Point group: D2
Amino acid sequence: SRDRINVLLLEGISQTAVEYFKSSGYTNVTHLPKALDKADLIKAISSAHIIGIRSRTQLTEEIFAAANRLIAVGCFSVGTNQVELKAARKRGIPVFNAPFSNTRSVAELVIGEIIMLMRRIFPRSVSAHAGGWEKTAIGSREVRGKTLGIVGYGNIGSQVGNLAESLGMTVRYYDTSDKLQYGNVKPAASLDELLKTSDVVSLHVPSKLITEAKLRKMKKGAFLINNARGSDVDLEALAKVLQEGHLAGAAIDVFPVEPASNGERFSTPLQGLENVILTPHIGGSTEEAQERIGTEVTRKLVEYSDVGSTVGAVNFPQVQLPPRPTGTRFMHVHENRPGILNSLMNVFSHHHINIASQFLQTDGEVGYLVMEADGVGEASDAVLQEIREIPGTIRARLLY
Amino acid sequence: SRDRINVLLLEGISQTAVEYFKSSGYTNVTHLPKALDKADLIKAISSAHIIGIRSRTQLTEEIFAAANRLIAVGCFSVGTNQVELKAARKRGIPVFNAPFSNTRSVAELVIGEIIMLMRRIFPRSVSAHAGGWEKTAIGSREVRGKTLGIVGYGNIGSQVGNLAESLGMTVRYYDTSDKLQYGNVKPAASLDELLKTSDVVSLHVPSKLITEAKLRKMKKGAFLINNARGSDVDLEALAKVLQEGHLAGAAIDVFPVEPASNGERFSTPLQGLENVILTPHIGGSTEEAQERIGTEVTRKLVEYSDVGSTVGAVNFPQVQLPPRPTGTRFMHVHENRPGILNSLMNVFSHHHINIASQFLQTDGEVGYLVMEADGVGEASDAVLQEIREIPGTIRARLLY
Amino acid sequence: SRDRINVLLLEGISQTAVEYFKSSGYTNVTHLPKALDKADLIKAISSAHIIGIRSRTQLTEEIFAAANRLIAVGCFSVGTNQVELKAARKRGIPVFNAPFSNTRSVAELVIGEIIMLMRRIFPRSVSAHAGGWEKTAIGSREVRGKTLGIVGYGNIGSQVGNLAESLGMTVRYYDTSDKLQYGNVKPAASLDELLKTSDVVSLHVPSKLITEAKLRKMKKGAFLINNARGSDVDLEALAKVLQEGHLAGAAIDVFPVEPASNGERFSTPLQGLENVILTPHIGGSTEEAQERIGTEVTRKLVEYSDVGSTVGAVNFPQVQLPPRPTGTRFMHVHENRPGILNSLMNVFSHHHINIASQFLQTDGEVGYLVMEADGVGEASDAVLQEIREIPGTIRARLLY
Amino acid sequence: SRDRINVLLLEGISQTAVEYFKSSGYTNVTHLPKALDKADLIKAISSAHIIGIRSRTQLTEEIFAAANRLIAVGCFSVGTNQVELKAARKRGIPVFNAPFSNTRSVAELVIGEIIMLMRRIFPRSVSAHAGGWEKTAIGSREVRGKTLGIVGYGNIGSQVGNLAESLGMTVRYYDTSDKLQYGNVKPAASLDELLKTSDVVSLHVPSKLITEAKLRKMKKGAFLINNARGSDVDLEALAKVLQEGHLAGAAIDVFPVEPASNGERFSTPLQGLENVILTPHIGGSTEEAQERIGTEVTRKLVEYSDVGSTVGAVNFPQVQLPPRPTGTRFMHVHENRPGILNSLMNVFSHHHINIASQFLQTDGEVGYLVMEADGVGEASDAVLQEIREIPGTIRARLLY
């Protein structure tokens, strides 16, 4: 029964998550609008099977030590810096995030920013609020006909490309593991070739690439956007080439050092520069991304709890195995002790239970084995109890 | 010979204009990068047949009085407030502008601004430059799935609609003289219906529509963009509903009162408000629009000078008449004296010249007649000289 | 009153025409599902002001001689070969057709045929009906990636291009009066260049271009489609190059000689050839084109009857003149007698009526003058009666 | 060394396959343009590691018995009816086909056929070749504005939908495991709802659904296309409803009984019916699909031979396991003897070799295990030799 699985959701996680749990039979859901202090968290997590958090709840070894029943963590966000990932792994707890939910929010932002930057709209508006009047066409340009260079052509890169094309831009990309043409979108032979031949360069590197040398290769009057990785651009070098008037503008969402909360001062050498849009790491922060995150992370948690899939876990060996309509399914998390597979297989033989399929994956800390078997009822319970006792076992359970 | 037609171009008009004149046989082109003072202008215009200006050159009756040979004025811009239009008309001088060149520049701006406003990017960037850090999804939204309401569905309106659709917006329009559906773009039954059901309203009224009453009909959290007419919105009422937090943001390119140059202070009650983009009437100001203006206005001037077409003139009866490969073509500008048509026809009979087609259009000040006739050589010269002498005649010439 | 204007519609003209007349105030509509014989036609047309026909009704001088009141003919079809156009003109009767209604029907047909031809579907289906089984990929190809060459880039040509692009074709065009690029659609420098570099050539020449020499310039394995003009291709030469296997297929909707009705034998040297689609001049024949024709031709007839516009008439000088909300509007059709303009102007002066605008156009048979004037009531009636009496006058009327 | 792997390619497999093998280091390629007889096949396959065939080569148990070294079969085609799939499986030989290569060829065909059918082009062309002339708009329609109902919304279904939308059709789909909306493409609630509300129904069921009852639910004048599964439509019932004139046409590529080659008579009750396109199972038969098949199937074969992946094999447990840059990778195919996993694990322990990951999948005939291990050199050779000797082993090898 899934109504016995205690789901605890913190920090005002979207209602799309609560609904997804319910429709999956996970009706035992405690949903809070706030973060908890260490003490309330220790109390509340004490009986939790599944916890969902956002950016404020800190999940450390000390918390896991109190979490007697916890099987999985959902980070209802892109990042996972609030969870001790290795501590969770060593306790056989996968942590899931929402890596693709933000895609559309980042892509729209890039496209809007390309227009604002090529038109110099931000300095014009700052000036207008102050009483200035900068009515002039010089240095102001249409995006139609211009070349966008995209560095990293994954999910976001290609959505950015799609939208840029509908705006009449010529789109090129550089990506170390793709050279295919996509309709009118062509690969550049190299990063440098892309930099030299683009009017706007937007960084979309998958989770310094752009040094002063790279910036000086860009066309005079060109623009840089980085809404992807905070350590990818030398921002001191960017400030210099902007002040020289080599580059005409930039938009930057991510920084080498970002405030540890909205209640501490932000500093960057781009501050005070003309035609620079600075955004507080909000590329993925929309109401609609929050909704998609609620669904994405809950889907992962439901699938983990039902059938032990860990594909997409950020801290765990990635295992997926087609479920079967008969027999029983087991998972076993262990230390990587030599010969533990033998012990596991031996337990199954001993109980006359045949394994129909299995998937083992391992990393430096744990091995994770999921198995489909033909045992049923009490014979399966007995194999479970015995595999739990093999030395090096971290946890094991029966699955649907 | 067209190389005898003195073309004078002022204020750094795009080189696309100079080239268009040349390729048309108009090789006699004086091109200046600057505006002229009253005195230099009087001197330089004294022998000009065609003058092209931008925003700084003032063309008044006093100037036309000095312009012995002037047949046409090109305003290499959207507006025409620098030319005394009626004074030009009364002297039989059409003035041509570039009414459609700006279209793409306005449409791109609207689309970029919709994204910046729905995401609250401008206040976030102002805050970031000052050291603030506003990392939050609340009130921040994707444009995909949202409804854009377009008021005025002409050239710009429909381009705005095209681009908004490619960004996944649902697009509706209100226009008093169109109710047709265009693919997925549907008409609203009324202005109020459009206002009530849009997330963003963008004004594109062809050359106050939005009062406090209209603003209060808009959805709480909605956005207004006006990049079209400066007197269409009550900006004091807009400031109020923004401060109340009824509307979440606005972008405004045009104002009831705008500085008489970049060297005088701009004032608006929107100044200092959060999530308001203020732009100094630059909706049409791009390098690419300047290029298109150079071509558009030169095409009009060339066609006027060659065959007397005045369709598109902003101050003149609109006449167009298919040219014929034989005989002679005449134009005659006159005061609207009763019976002047009789006198004109009588002159033609007297010289045994038959009119094959003609188009007369008139307004409060002038009549403009273009005629195709079968006269040739000296017989045509004689009809010209005589029609020039009819009382009330302002000017007449032979055409190609 | 428009309910006094007798509209007679023949041959089952779409109901969209009847509705358009009604909504325009033209309520006096006799609508028949059939063609009439000479005798019934003479009787029925005797009091008709406006007649609409399709392909079977023959309108000759003899019929017009019986048509005491007829002002206009609507050919509710693309062609106009059933009307004596010159006879109508000489009686001051414009004839209007539906030149653009067919556009979409032709464009869809071309695109479907390109696929059938490149895949050799028609010979495969003929073979399958007869019990043959030609399962083979040889000579069978996808249209994606292929080059369509379009000869004549007007209305149909560009719609054909749009659709072909959505199917992943590269589209080029040759047109003697256009060299502009449209997005990804590029002009060829010449007809021969287009022929040599296309996989499929489709003819869309506006109302022999393709000789054996042209066919032999096409790529081996290429395809020709002619759904435009019946005399544009040497079909005997096409049959030869098809039998040689130089061209791989063709689709042809139009022929140098076509049966004078569906009740007479059709002959062409393409008959019996493999991978040739022969269609009986149905490129424009759809239920939806019939509907659009009903609207298009009725719009022309309504506008002619209301305000005398003849733009789009196939047999008449093309005149359009903006209507004014005051005074009176006149039209006058005449023989081209020298000095008739003088007589007309003199009549107007005599009655102290001032002409505010006018448009005269003429051809070899008639002059057509439309005039806006400031007369009202009985003064206008008197000018009408007198201009009707000027020698050479064919007809005249007051307009709205 | 891969140049030691004997690749034998038969029946004129596209050159894209030969190139893909070469670039992968598989240089030992014998490529024939023809099928082989039993005797030549037995000889040629005797030393083959990998064989590629098309539709004529028959691979039976008798052939496999002669194939001492064969590890994999490539069916360079969609179907696999020429290979004894179970016989191959029992010998531990996966068979790979090209399930997605045909997608574009099927989608284009459907779209062309929709146009031909709605326009009744095929009967018109049959008639024209015979001298008939059927110039008429009745029953002839544009596809723009019409509803396409798609049954099965997988790969082909959605490409069909994309293309149909670009042609201005409204597209709906019924699929038992999808209810999501895709842009403007909406799911129907049921098969019957889709049938009742479509103008054209196209079947794209993944590898009788449409009975007389279903056909009679379709709109009078509607069209059916089946280019997917040969047993999905009652063709006798289709012939009846066509003859009654309930349905206006059909296109059918696949039949309950199809000739065993191009040299035997084809029979179907649709033969001789008007507006029925019959195609000899060529929906996937293009030159471009043949090229894509060459690449697709070779990619599968290369990946199987290098790292033992069997995802996409049509006759084999589906196994994929991320490769590691160190240690050794093993595969083992066996009979499903209880306790064989224990024996395998025991062999590895005995040689002190640790397994880092593994994936077992099984079906009714075989178990297939792929393993990543930390053995190297001679220790790995010794484990290989010993696991080959476990009773029930079909084959085992080392991998890259």
